[PDB]
Amino acid sequence: VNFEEVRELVPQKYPFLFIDKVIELQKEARIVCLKNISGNEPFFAGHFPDFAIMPGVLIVEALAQASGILFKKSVFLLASANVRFSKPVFPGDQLILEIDIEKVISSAAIVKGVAKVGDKVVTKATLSFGVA
Amino acid sequence: VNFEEVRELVPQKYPFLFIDKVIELQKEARIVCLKNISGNEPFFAGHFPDFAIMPGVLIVEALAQASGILFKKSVFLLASANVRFSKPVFPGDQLILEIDIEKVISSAAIVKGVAKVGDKVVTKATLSFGVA
Amino acid sequence: VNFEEVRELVPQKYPFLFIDKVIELQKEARIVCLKNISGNEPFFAGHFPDFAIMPGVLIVEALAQASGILFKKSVFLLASANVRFSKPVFPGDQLILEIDIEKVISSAAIVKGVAKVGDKVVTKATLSFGVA
Amino acid sequence: VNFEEVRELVPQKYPFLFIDKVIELQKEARIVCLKNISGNEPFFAGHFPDFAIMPGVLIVEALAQASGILFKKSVFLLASANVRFSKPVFPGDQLILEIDIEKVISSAAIVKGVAKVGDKVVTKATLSFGVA
Amino acid sequence: VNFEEVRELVPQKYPFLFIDKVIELQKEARIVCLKNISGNEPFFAGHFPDFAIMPGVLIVEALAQASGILFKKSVFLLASANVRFSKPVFPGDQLILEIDIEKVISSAAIVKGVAKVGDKVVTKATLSFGVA
Amino acid sequence: VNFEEVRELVPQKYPFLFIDKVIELQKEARIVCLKNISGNEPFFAGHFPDFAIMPGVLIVEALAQASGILFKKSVFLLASANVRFSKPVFPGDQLILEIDIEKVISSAAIVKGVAKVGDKVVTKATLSFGVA
């Protein structure tokens, strides 16, 4: 799934759309998305002036947006997140977002999310969503 | 503590500085900060086009930035977050960020964070930080 | 009137929409709007680098936009303004915009505008509008 | 006076610096500045989506910034403005800002300002300033 | 052709629309467009911090956009450019873009482009376009 | 060479810095840089609204910035460019910028530039630079 289709599937848009492509999709089970990290993204100017580092909370948003694509291809709001920020992410990194569905019911979903650069895990999370 | 002092204390800057004022400060114990939510903030255009709602992850960042002010007045990176997004936040809301220190050691800190609009709690979190 | 309705009523949009909510409305007579002042608004970076202060001219625009909501609920262009900038406005302030209709005719309107933080008046203005 | 010198003289900066060049300068008396109006300026996206028109309040800010250059070559804050918005200004216009000093004292200054496109006057104003 | 019509004719939009007006049009032959250069355009902050100078590549884009208007009034993508950057362009300059059609076929077009400030040539280019 | 060092070496900055990392460096001979293409870069909103495609002129700027790093490690202004835009570039692409020095003299330099996604060439250029 390329960016033009991602734009349609993800309700977020610039400057808060943090998916570039879908790499792998197993409906009702798992998705793998790609987000390129670029020094020309607007948030880097503020985090931090002396040192550009991807904010951990935006990796969480990227994992949430990847999940939403998985849900739509199988209004969701993030309801909870339990997240470990293991390693920093920098301009020039390719961020791989892997979502596995834990449990989906009519009203909610719980997923496990892993963000990777290369095959080093930089962020791990459990997320839940409520329909709204 | 007014915004000009906040600017100095918080290493983040526009468009990723999410504190306006410090309302209450008890060194080594607790801080209460204020963030005004304005429809003229850049993230609202992308979250969401049809419906401006404050992203939950940016409330987490605001709680993390409030914590950093508490630490500095008593390089911190968010190391973990366990967060419940209870209620939505809108342009025109005044977001109150309350941080209580759970445990501080030389290398890390664990805090409990509550975000409120009025005296309704909209977000509750446990956050941990590592020195870097 | 909440922000989603304000967005529709006010033709301006980001980064030039300076109303968050309507607090009070008496058709054909008076309106009270709220604009949250946030350090994360784009104009603060340029006014001024060393010292964030709300530009007086944007308080005038906010008063003009509040007036337009009053007109619409009872293409307007600001035709004249006679304004006194009494006190400065800062990130973290809640700006209250009070408009009283002086005279409305088919082609024009003259209003008196008061901007307040708390119940201190920070700006007072007489504004006129022409239909266009 | 070219833009690089204007940048230094005017404390405002992007996105709130509304002078490009100084065309004429008579110390203690009069200044003529130029501001190019470009469709690629950020405020046009919001004023208005269907129709790009220069906001009258930003012409007032440009007149105020021209005045400040005159003062500096002979912290000023706009204290009052009495302004008539006669004609609209569009992308592609060259806005000429003419300031004549009415009265300068140690604490304040009163000026008359005229904004022109070609030699048609689009805005006329009396402005006052207080030292701060 | 004024900016509102330019907006419709040129598929690019803010922050990548670099035409303000069409000054002269001879269908199937030549066009002259105007782009005002303003210090309040977003690219100047990054090119360069110490010294605002219009990037040569954006003059090429402006010449390409002028060409597209000529084509439409008589999806085009720039296919090739052979360009000489002779003189620098600054905030406050009025950039005149002159396009002469060399050869148009069903699938492609080759044009000669000249950018001028006053009647000094600042950029000269041969451009080709392919339909897409 | 990582982004923090790139920031220092390249005089351009956000929103006009189009290098993320240096991948390969042979002083006085060749450089290979990486620019991640992200849908969250500000230029995509304007090029084009219906269809995000990297502007060819910004690939030229990226090649020019890669060249400048090569020059500095062995004020440069682009003096000429002769460029072929062969294939389009999209959000999610990793753009590889390869510069080979043709000739360097005290006053000028001529280089050959190739931009690649994967190992498909998307842009080829000859560029010249003059010291300034």
If you had to describe this structure to a student in words, what would you say it looks like?
- Chains A, B, C, D, E, F: One of its GO terms (cellular component) is cytoplasm.
- Chains A, B, C, D, E, F: Keywords: Cytoplasm, Lipid A biosynthesis, Lipid biosynthesis, Lipid metabolism, Lyase.
- Chains A, B, C, D, E, F: InterPro entries: FabA_FabZ, HotDog_dom_sf.
- 6 copies of one chain form a homohexamer.
- With 132 residues, chain A is α+β, with helices and mostly antiparallel strands.
- The first copy, chain A, has a single domain, classed as Thiol Ester Dehydrase, Chain A (Roll), CATH 3.10.129.10.
- Chain A has 2 helices and 6 strands; from the N terminus they run H-E-E-H-E-E-E-E.
- Chain A has a 6-stranded antiparallel sheet with strand order 1-2-4-5-6-3, covered by helices on one side.
- In chain A, a hairpin with a 3-residue loop joins strand 1 and strand 2.
- The longest helix of chain A is centred in the middle third of the chain and has 18 residues.
- The two termini of chain A are 25 Å apart.
- Strand 3 of chain C pairs antiparallel with strand 3 of chain D.
